Design a protein around this ligand. Sequence first.
Ligand SMILES: *[C@@H]1O[C@H](CO)[C@@H](O[C@@H]2O[C@H](CO)[C@@H](O[C@@H]3O[C@H](CO[C@H]4O[C@H](CO)[C@@H](O)[C@H](O)[C@@H]4O)[C@@H](O)[C@H](O[C@H]4O[C@H](CO)[C@@H](O)[C@H](O)[C@@H]4O)[C@@H]3O)[C@H](O)[C@H]2NC(C)=O)[C@H](O)[C@H]1NC(C)=O
Ligand SMILES: *[C@@H]1O[C@H](CO)[C@@H](O[C@@H]2O[C@H](CO)[C@@H](O[C@@H]3O[C@H](CO[C@H]4O[C@H](CO)[C@@H](O)[C@H](O)[C@@H]4O)[C@@H](O)[C@H](O[C@H]4O[C@H](CO)[C@@H](O)[C@H](O)[C@@H]4O)[C@@H]3O)[C@H](O)[C@H]2NC(C)=O)[C@H](O)[C@H]1NC(C)=O
Ligand SMILES: [Ca+2]
Ligand SMILES: [Zn+2]
Ligand SMILES: [Zn+2]
Lengths: 630, 239
Amino acid sequence: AIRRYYLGAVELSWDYRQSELLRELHVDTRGPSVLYKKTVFVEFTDQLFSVARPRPPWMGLLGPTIQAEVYDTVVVTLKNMASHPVSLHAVGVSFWKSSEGAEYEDHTSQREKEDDKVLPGKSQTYVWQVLKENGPTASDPPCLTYSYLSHVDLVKDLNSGLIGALLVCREGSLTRERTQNLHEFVLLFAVFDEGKSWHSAAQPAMHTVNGYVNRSLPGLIGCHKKSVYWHVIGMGTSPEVHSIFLEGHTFLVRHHRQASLEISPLTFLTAQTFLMDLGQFLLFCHISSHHHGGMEAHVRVESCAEKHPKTWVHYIAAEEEDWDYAPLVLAPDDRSYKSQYLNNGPQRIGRKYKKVRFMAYTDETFKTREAIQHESGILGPLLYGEVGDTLLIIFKNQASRPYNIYPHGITDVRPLYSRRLPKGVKHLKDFPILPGEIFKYKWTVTVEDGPTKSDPRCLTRYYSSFVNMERDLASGLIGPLLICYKSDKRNVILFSVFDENRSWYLTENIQRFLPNPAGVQLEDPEFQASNIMHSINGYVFDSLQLSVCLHEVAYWYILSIGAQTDFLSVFFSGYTFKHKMVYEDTLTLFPFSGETVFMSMENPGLWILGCHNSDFRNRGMTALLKVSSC
Amino acid sequence: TFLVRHHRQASLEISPLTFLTAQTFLMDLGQFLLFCHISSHHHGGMEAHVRVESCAEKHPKTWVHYIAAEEEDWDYAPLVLAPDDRSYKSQYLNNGPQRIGRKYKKVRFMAYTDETFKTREAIQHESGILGPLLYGEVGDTLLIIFKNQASRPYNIYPHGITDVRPLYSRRLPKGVKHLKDFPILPGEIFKYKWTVTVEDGPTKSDPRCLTRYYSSFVNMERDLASGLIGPLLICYKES
Ligand SMILES: *[C@@H]1O[C@H](CO)[C@@H](O[C@@H]2O[C@H](CO)[C@@H](O[C@@H]3O[C@H](CO[C@H]4O[C@H](CO)[C@@H](O)[C@H](O)[C@@H]4O)[C@@H](O)[C@H](O[C@H]4O[C@H](CO)[C@@H](O)[C@H](O)[C@@H]4O)[C@@H]3O)[C@H](O)[C@H]2NC(C)=O)[C@H](O)[C@H]1NC(C)=O
Ligand SMILES: *[C@@H]1O[C@H](CO)[C@@H](O[C@@H]2O[C@H](CO)[C@@H](O[C@@H]3O[C@H](CO[C@H]4O[C@H](CO)[C@@H](O)[C@H](O)[C@@H]4O)[C@@H](O)[C@H](O[C@H]4O[C@H](CO)[C@@H](O)[C@H](O)[C@@H]4O)[C@@H]3O)[C@H](O)[C@H]2NC(C)=O)[C@H](O)[C@H]1NC(C)=O
Ligand SMILES: [Ca+2]
Ligand SMILES: [Zn+2]
Ligand SMILES: [Zn+2]
């Protein structure tokens, strides 16, 4: 029907960590530091605006979360009690330009510019219509995730805290079904720039979930063997992206099995997550800045009241190896780029570096390697398993440091004979394997691990070493893993900036490749530039070269995994490929996320496999792909 | 499981002034019923909860069995050994005014050869009534393709193995707290993955194999009484 909401821009002091500075956002009737001045949306219950409704602890600075279903009119009343002017712009629903809330040259009456910018002390009704075409489209979820926000100075209004959730829903908002069994929650992945808010206009970038930083944020509880539905809003006033993982868990956005959850300002998702594991799981942003960290927040699950598989055996070894990214085929020059990065210089390792990597072997002897195929370059062996199959990973460490082999995207991994982790260890992916030793891993592919009838027949995933995620990956430990449903040359591409300055072996390479190992400046910022190899599979600059038969109708499992922090927009110079049931011609990949694009080779030149993000291209990140007939 | 003296024990056998030090090890978060299991539900105050909680700081075979719950006429005494009778024998095994006697119709577990359940694997005299011998060393997996074929909804679940999920999925079909009490219907088939882990197996100090059993659990009492029972060994690696 009709829906009345009373909001009110309230100024508050906020430290991003203590849910107790929320109580000040209540209302009348009648250390340790940091603390910033902010302003938020608070509900009220009267039009007198003397009755607050309490801020739920888990919402943080989020606004009161207005809901209406289709055909409902929404009446909302701002009251600007903040130092500054505010507004109330809705995304997702109909207005009339006086219940809009942004000012521009719209050739409208001066009272149709009261919505546009309300003033301190003042107040303003708004009227939003949920039209018949405002709603779910059937193939969407029962509710759509949107947002109101103050809209007089978008940079300041967002960074000050004026945002809240807004859910247009089908008919049957009120239907009721699973009383807090199926939990909905609002997750506002947002970067509040406390330096670019109405306050002090040298300050800091807060990377928050609902306004909390470091694993604060009470209240994210979920009933055990049931689903939880996240309503997702990204937010910021600069670009920035976030990869949002949940430990032990995959999401379900559209009707796809998302494992990454890829977000940017004003991304609006409804993701579903089935919970089948008691305990605590970390919801966090995987971008290697930890400046993009701080977006961490615990998620407790608790228990509330009321054609026959194959087993794949693998003998993988972490073993060290001279490796060069320009495999003595790249003719150099003397100017720069491919000469600073490659080309053994006086203060430059050049192009040959000591790496460690996963390698296949035929039996437990580890005394004969296996096939190779040089297309899949630095990569470890290719690991496959349809839903229902087990993977037996007999892993020997033949290198110096302790290393590891853990799957990303398999959930049910444990040692082969017992479910009991060893020694003092709390989780296998922390449990290091000392040089010389074997460990036997069992990777069990369940159904919630893989394709959903609506996404590919093979989800592209990686494995790697986790005793030191970042540096082990740098050092060369990475491998493709496919997780299919129920046949090809195979085709795996991995865009990997290999930050050799993190490589455990940089110390060895420094000695074994500079002529001045004695006198080396480890912080010459182009010396370290000389060691970021912007690599496709193994090789920088067109050293990689794919040969596919003309007409060979392919299948490309691509991944962006490496020192990267920016999303890689990625192309095949000549072709289009079939992605998520449509064709595209750019495939965007956030860090640590792989996609499967199905391609048919038919026009027949020699093209260029490359990113799109120019300043990566000019530092190597380029393959070749020649097609011709046969 | 309980570890006592140095043996994996499933129950604690106790009685007036019995004294033990048993230790157990907690891999699954949750709440589990500690309880005395004697058929006489009076024995049924001995029931306490234990909550477990996070705190602070050669190659293993896969065995495949096609098993059917299915009804048959069961004979308790198919061997002509009657005469001896100034001693009870008559009462339990004669027909007339109000004795079924000795041929009761029961339902058993019965091993078949494939998903078709149209042909039976090898029976064997001596184990009569009890379902097929289900072996499994530490590390192995048992695929229990189960098909019903009876006149009540039954089920098959092993006491002995911790890790018994459905095959393929790890999540249970309906508002099902537990695969143990979830029933199987018309002649539906369910496919289970029993995985024998170390903490199910013997302990150096006890035998190569240790003796367990499976049964329908939709109603433990009357199902087992109808005859849904069969043996499960759990053993160690390297007539
Ligand atoms: C959630 O957790 C993360 C990660 O731990 C925190 O991120 C840290 O951010 C702080 C800065 O905000 C850093 O750690 C601390 O930095 C302070 C110094 O850095 C700033 O300090 C002055 C303050 O005037 C600024 O002008 C200057 O430009 C710097 O930016 C210190 O106050 C801290 O104390 C240390 O300083 C000296 C050591 O010589 C001693 O007095 C102390 O012994 C102590 O060591 C500390 O260094 C750092 O950037 C981040 N930490 C890490 C590990 O990366 C978030 O702040 C946190 N969220 C909270 C707290 O809400
Ligand atoms: C823990 O467990 C359960 C709860 O889950 C409870 O068990 C039953 O509790 C009910 C009461 O809530 C009992 O029912 C009544 O018991 C009365 C006491 O007699 C008992 O004591 C003798 C002692 O030898 C037993 O042999 C006997 O069988 C009884 O168990 C009876 O007087 C009641 O009889 C009914 O029928 C007669 C016959 O016509 C009527 O005249 C009566 O008016 C009445 O209607 C009734 O049976 C039940 O017996 C309990 N079960 C058992 C197995 O004991 C526990 O109470 C609970 N709490 C504890 C143990 O503290
Ligand atoms: Ca307007
Ligand atoms: Zn981030
Ligand atoms: Zn008892």
